[PDB]
RNA sequence: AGGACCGAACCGACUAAUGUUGAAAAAUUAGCGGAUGACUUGUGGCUGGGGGUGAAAGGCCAAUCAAACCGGGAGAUAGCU
RNA sequence: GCUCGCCGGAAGACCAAGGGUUCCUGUCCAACGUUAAUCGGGGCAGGGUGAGUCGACCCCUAAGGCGAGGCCGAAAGGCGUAGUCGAUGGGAAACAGGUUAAUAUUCCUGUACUUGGUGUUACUGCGAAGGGGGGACGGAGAAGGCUAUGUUGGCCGGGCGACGGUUGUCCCGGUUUAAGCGUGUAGGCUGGUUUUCCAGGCAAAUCCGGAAAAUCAAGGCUGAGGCGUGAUGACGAGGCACUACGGUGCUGAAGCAACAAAUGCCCUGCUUCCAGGAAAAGCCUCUAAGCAUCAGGUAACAUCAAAUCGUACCCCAAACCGACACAGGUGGUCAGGUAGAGAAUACCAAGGCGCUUGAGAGAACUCGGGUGAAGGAACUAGGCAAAAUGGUGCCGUAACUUCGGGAGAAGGCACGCUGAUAUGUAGGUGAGGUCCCUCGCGGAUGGAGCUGAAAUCAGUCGAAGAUACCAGCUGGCUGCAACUGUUUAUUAAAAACACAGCACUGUGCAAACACGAAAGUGGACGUAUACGGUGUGACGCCUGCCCGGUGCCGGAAGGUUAAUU
RNA sequence: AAUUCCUUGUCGGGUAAGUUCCGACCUGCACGAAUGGCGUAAUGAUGGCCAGGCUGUCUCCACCCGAGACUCAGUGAAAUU
RNA sequence: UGAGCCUGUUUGAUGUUCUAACGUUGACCCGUAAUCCGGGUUGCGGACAGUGUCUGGUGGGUAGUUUGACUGGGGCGGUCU
């Protein structure tokens, strides 16, 4: 649900929250945790290579299963959980042989449901099959790009992909950007779409909210001196030049892709 | 008012010590220069 | 509940007087702002000079910065005093 | 030696970092000490630091560093695997009294605890570089149980007062005791036991995870305080005999109860929120290769061991960082009384100091302060500086508004002391005595003793009762930036920077982009509801016309055009 | 008008007297729509103007309490020439 | 399908197909007690991609420098045979 806050303070006047009562209140499953340290945007030379990163809350990593092997064994859903590393919720599942795992939670999945993977599974949300075995015209998420590698497309909150055609050993997909693409028909996918579709209806409200997530302030190039940026200088407010990046490359229109190795798999670029 | 020099033995020894000088090719050149000049104290280590 | 209110410890530096071969190569006395947060503090670590870092003042990098310090080319050149 | 003054959340006491003999005793006054010096942190000589339990060393890892083979690079060299280092974090064990001129949880007296090696006896399936458990973790809030510690009464010893009174409802002092061992309470969490089966934990498993039956309803873990012992002991005002002025030998009274009460402990607990809150070992279990007469495991006794380095002194300062015996800077711990909301402020306790030139006089002028007839901003660029308001309870309070605010708006009234209601009220705490029951640190009744607000009525003193310290000035019209925040260390704190929100554009993952001759690394253990660049800057109503010039995006017919031949 | 040279433009308000201030007119030297246009409650050690209380800021200065300046004894500098 | 020689031969261009050079930051086995490295088996690409030498375009991202004299001061104006 989406809730507005009341204006008891100027920092609270403009806050909208997404509240979900079905998420677990407790500690996560321990045998599937690891430590994760912060970088500040620095590489092994010690230099800043990506700007505006630093600080925030401490987080631990949850091992999620993007391969979805283990065909033939049904699994049941135990609970849904909050994860600080991504923008989608996760789910804990228990197999009939006594094994536990974390998976991405689709839309409409509760506690007490069943799921399966393999060539001879049913067509229902949460099940996994190779795309050679899925009817054309379907909506899927968590799609592989090589057989046996793991999902790499449509993993964010509310996203999905469409199967548009099949021809020979390949299938054609429509992606969220508007692109049409080709992939081998032996790849795997999951039925449905990713949940938590209200994630984009939240307003942060104050600068500290962005600071809580590890984001540092942005300084405009027009406010610097000529020795710092191509946009600096002036007696007052002056621009008089075509906008460029901090390293002298034109922004606002120029294209940048160059990869002749993969050009045979793009059918039509995004419009 | 706070000033520039604030002592610490561990940091002193990790920065300018004998083993630090020996760990690198230029530090050995510092040691050779000082030996050729004939200094009574070669490094900061006691 | 809150980048909420009044106010000590703690962190700052808006006004005036003194001081200017000072008690002090930037301070003292009387007032002043924040004070559960984008807060403050101890120990260790990483980024090196046409390079770093910068909520951006050409600011800071050991009382030195529109290109640090030390040694060398070196007795640079000086139609000038 | 007697009097006076100053600090007392410090200007007292104990440490880490840093320094290194400044510590104690004898002797000297040339130089050092902003003056004299018989004195000194000065010169000279001698003395002083005692550990199985405090620290370091040692076992274990974080950020990061180095790195056999390896990949890459004109040389020099760069990055990295198996490994090995690195605390600011995890890992066994000790208390009270006495003593030196100078050391003490180390020396002496009394009473304790922990980890290993070897031997004897009695029972017995042991075994890891591997599997499982544990260690093991955020912010804020509330109120119940306690202790440190304080006040008063009872008890014991002493006193009867330099000037009116003081055998009493009077005055002064003391009333202290640990670790360990036994008991398992206020309280928190969790159903217990047996049998059978199984695509999981690389292989195995009696251990963990999962499924199906029967049976019992009470089992288990954690836990402050109090009580007993330790203690017929030690300490203790004072007395019996001399003093080297530091002290010796002996003796030695009382040593209880009530109330108030922490920011400390139960609490790594409980309730709630989103920004979702370290690693490895020590420790408890499970088996594999292997050994099974052996070796090994559990318990009881006897004996041996626990090495090496630090330990003096200063530590908000004359011993550290500032060239100085410099009005500056420097992290942790302890927290008495009266008034007070308080760690503010005033006066005191234990304890520590009067800051290393003095003595006179009482001119102009300069510095820091107190008071002012009549007027009340006439001063000045400008009410600059000064003067003024200031507490608690109650009455009462406008335009405008994003409905939260504006608001402590503005402007008012009461306030000391003594008596009664009530020889101390409403509340709080709680002993004897009487019953109940598995019998205990139990339940019900009961009210002695102690402690104790606020209000109303009638009186009374002064010019003044929030009497000292402490402690908001208020209202009306307008420019700029929505707001909390940031910045020119040392003449500029602002309308400048950032910000939540909005829009354009790039980017299909070996992503775009950035650091790198390269190998590689960040972006990210992320995947278009994601990530990078550019401009505007909460919110409300909005954002018109121009593609001729310079950029960017698409086209490919015609003209011009490189190496090469 | 943080924008207007001519300019102290012209009219109204506030004062005994107002080149600054508030409300209007339009002759915009040389405003104007994300190098954004017009508004806006709350907030500000931010710029401008008017009131009450208060006063040694002032007419115009007078007295007092402390630290120096002055005299005695000890020590004992500086810029410049 | 266009050019040379006596239908056949030599040599260009365009378009399908193939595997054996080359790529793999897909899966499995070993060195091994190892998310680096090498070898082996198997999928997917495939003479494309990528690197060396030569060559045309773009290139204030970075570097080395030039930007005259007379003159009732200099600049603006005028001038220099």
Residue numbers in the entry:
A (entry chain A): 2 to 272
B (entry chain c): 1 to 46
Q: How did the manuscript describe this experimental structure?
A:
N6-methyladenosine (m6A) is an abundant, dynamic mRNA modification that regulates key steps of cellular mRNA metabolism. m6A in the mRNA coding regions inhibits translation elongation. The majority of m6A sites are mapped within mRNA coding regions, where the modification can modulate codon reading by aminoacyl-tRNA (aa-tRNA) in the A site of the ribosome. Here, we show how m6A modulates decoding in the bacterial translation system using a combination of rapid kinetics, smFRET and single-particle cryo-EM. The mRNA codon adopts a π-stacked codon conformation that is remodeled upon aminoacyl-tRNA binding. m6A does not exclude canonical codon-anticodon geometry, but favors alternative more dynamic conformations that are rejected by the ribosome.
